[PDB]
């Protein structure tokens, strides 16, 4: 049961320290990571309500010009499909995805979800060869299925994720009932220090983070030195309140966790929740030595793999 959050910084809330970090409102940072752009829109009208300040870089026009325009006008070939895909009251983890063309090389990937009456739209560049087929997941299921026991399953799962991603380090991090954790499997680049078998305090993944990760199963930091980009306006006009960004991979990472990653020499981080019978069982935790943007289709493959692994774990634990 997490503590109530304090207000975010931009609402005059306290600075976050090691004494109060379980109260950081990590779901409402009012900012995004700079490798993409984000807009929010009214769920009925499609009016664009908030835009990240870097929106021009990705969309080819200025935030001051795009705000107030409707998605019906801006995205005529996707707006109807988006609407149909994310009806009022759908789960906030449900996503609509489309690939758009843009002046630059490759394409823009569009990912949308719905929170309350708001649509949250993420745009990130993707290269054409950065497609991953359903084969990646399909062929991977084979070695997961043949694993004879839980620890073998964990070992194959980390190796498979490393093969799919090329990450320098992939761990299966399992939580204990006291919320401490243990690295129970690890696939890593030759020469990297092993974390295998190491245990970590509960505070390293605080309670509000673990709660969030129970609902929104994938998060990342593409560049652990990159400054966040504000949303403008920072509050949702629908509510005059902060915008929930837990469902957006572009959400700005807690600065506290960014420092933790830099202290470990990590350039890029990504993890996927393993949720068993609705409780957070563990994470597939990935590091890269340098900044790296795992493509959207591969992220989705990894989420799917976490769900598959959840079930395989749940099968084996019953035995």
Annotated binding site for a tetrapyrrole: 21
- Reading phi first (left if > 0) and then psi (alpha if -120 to 50, else beta), residue 147 is in beta
Buried b vs exposed e over 206-239: b needs ≥16 C-beta within 10 Å? bebbbebbeebbbbbbbbbeeebbbbeebbbeee
Between 49 and 218, whose beta carbon lies closer to ligand LBV? 218
Choose which of 253, 273, 310, 312 interacts with ligand LBV (CB under 6 A). Answer: 253
Cβ proximity to ligand LBV, 109 vs 208, nearer residue? 208
3-class secondary-structure state, position 125: strand
Structure tokens at 24: 């950081």
Smaller CB separation from ligand LBV, 157 or 205: 205
Work out whether 126 is an interface residue with ligand LBV (CB under 6 A): no
The token pair that represents 238 in the structure block? 């629908």
Tokens of 165: 């991603």
d(CA 231, CA 63): 10
User: Which range of residues in 63-71, 114-122, 139-147, 199-207 is near ligand LBV by CB under 6 A?
Assistant: 199-207
Is 207 an interacting residue with respect to ligand LBV (CB under 6 A)? no
Residue 273 sits in the site that holds ligand LBV (CB under 6 A): no
Instruction: Give dist(CA 212, CA 204) in Å, integer.
Output: 14
Span interacting with ligand LBV, options 89-97, 99-107, 115-123, 255-263, rule CB under 6 A: 255-263
Residues 284-313 contacting ligand LBV, CB under 6 A: 285
205 binds ligand LBV (CB under 6 A): yes
Measured from the CB of residue 242, what is the shortest distance to ligand LBV in angstroms?
Answer: 14
Closest separation in Å from C-beta 4 to ligand LBV: 15
Q: Which of 228, 226, 210 is nearest to 273 (CA)?
A: 210
Cβ atoms of 250 and 33 within 8 Å: the answer is yes
Q: Which of 245, 283, 294, 305 binds ligand LBV (CB under 6 A)?
A: 283
Q: Does 224 bind ligand LBV (CB under 6 A)?
A: no
Task: Out of 46, 63, 206, 295, name the contact with ligand LBV by CB under 6 A.
Answer: 206
Considering only CA atoms, give the Rg of the chain: 20
Cα 244 to Cα 214, 264, 282, 298: the distances in Å are 15, 29, 24, 24
Closest residue to bound ligand LBV by CB: 21
Applying CB under 6 A, the residues found at the interface with ligand LBV are 18, 21, 24, 26, 181, 183, 195, 200, 203-206, 209, 219, 221, 253-254, 256-257, 260, 269-271, 283, 285
């Amino acid at each position: 049961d997490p503590l109530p959050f304090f207000p975010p910084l931009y609402l005059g809330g306290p600075e976050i320290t090691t004494e109060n970090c379980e109260r950081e409102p990590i779901h409402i940072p009012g900012s995004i990571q700079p490798h993409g752009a984000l807009l929010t829109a009214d769920g009925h009208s499609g009016e664009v309500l908030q835009m990240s300040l870097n929106a021009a870089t990705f969309l080819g026009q200025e935030p001051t010009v795009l705000r107030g325009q409707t998605l019906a006008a801006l995205l005529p070939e996707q707006w109807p499909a988006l609407q149909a895909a994310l009806p009022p009251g759908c789960p906030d983890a449900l996503q609509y995805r489309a690939t758009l063309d843009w002046p630059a090389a490759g394409h823009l990937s569009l990912t949308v979800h719905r929170v309350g009456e708001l649509l949250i739209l993420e745009f990130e560049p993707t290269e054409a060869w950065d497609s991953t087929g359903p084969h990646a997941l399909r062929n991977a299921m084979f070695a997961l299925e043949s694993a004879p026991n839980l620890r073998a399953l964990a070992e194959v799962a980390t190796q498979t994720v490393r093969e799919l991603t090329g990450f320098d380090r992939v761990m299966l991090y399992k939580f204990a009932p006291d919320a401490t954790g243990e690295v129970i499997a690890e696939a890593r680049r030759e020469g990297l220090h092993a974390f295998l078998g190491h245990r970590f305090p509960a505070s390293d993944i605080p309670a509000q983070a673990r709660a969030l990760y129970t609902r929104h199963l994938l998060r990342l930091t593409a560049d652990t030195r990159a400054a966040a980009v504000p949303l403008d306006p920072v509050l949702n006009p629908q509510t005059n309140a902060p915008t929930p960004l837990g469902g957006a991979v572009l959400r700005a990472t807690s600065p506290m966790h960014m420092q933790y990653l830099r202290n470990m020499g990590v350039g890029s981080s990504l993890s996927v929740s393993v949720v068993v019978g609705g409780q957070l069982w563990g994470l597939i935790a990935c590091h890269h030595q340098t900044p790296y943007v795992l493509p959207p289709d591969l992220r989705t493959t990894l989420e799917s793999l976490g769900r598959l692994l959840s079930l395989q774990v749940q099968v084996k634990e019953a035995h």
